[PDB]
Amino acid sequence: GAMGKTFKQRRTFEQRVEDVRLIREQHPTKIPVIIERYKGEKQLPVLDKTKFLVPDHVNMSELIKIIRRRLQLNANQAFFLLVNGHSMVSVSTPISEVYESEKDEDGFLYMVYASQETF
């Protein structure tokens, strides 16, 4: 019997804090953010990976386009990104301030995406 174990299942809480801090040490110029497909996202495809490294000098317009590039998102269809599970950030806000405004207790950043403006 199959079992699709997400990143948090294959990496215990200890391994998670250790991974985040080690990432902050080796890649101090990158922010560890989780990009997960919404549980009801049926139209849009699943992201190839979940752990991303974004430079603090960028904005969401760019991050959105990077995901659109590899996910090969359609032009006739649109989507939104919810931070920690809430869509309240503007596309022009720098990820540096967004990171410290949404930082989790383990120090990781969570993000979920879907093709809908309201859940």
Binding site: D19, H27, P32, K49, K51, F52, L53, P55, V58, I66
Partner: peptide
């Protein structure tokens, strides 16, 4: 989970430095 190495776990953003 005996064997374990630094697999591709994180995916950095594409930019121009």
């Amino acid at each position: 989970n005996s064997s374990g190495s630094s697999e591709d776990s994180f995916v950095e953003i594409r930019m121009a430095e």
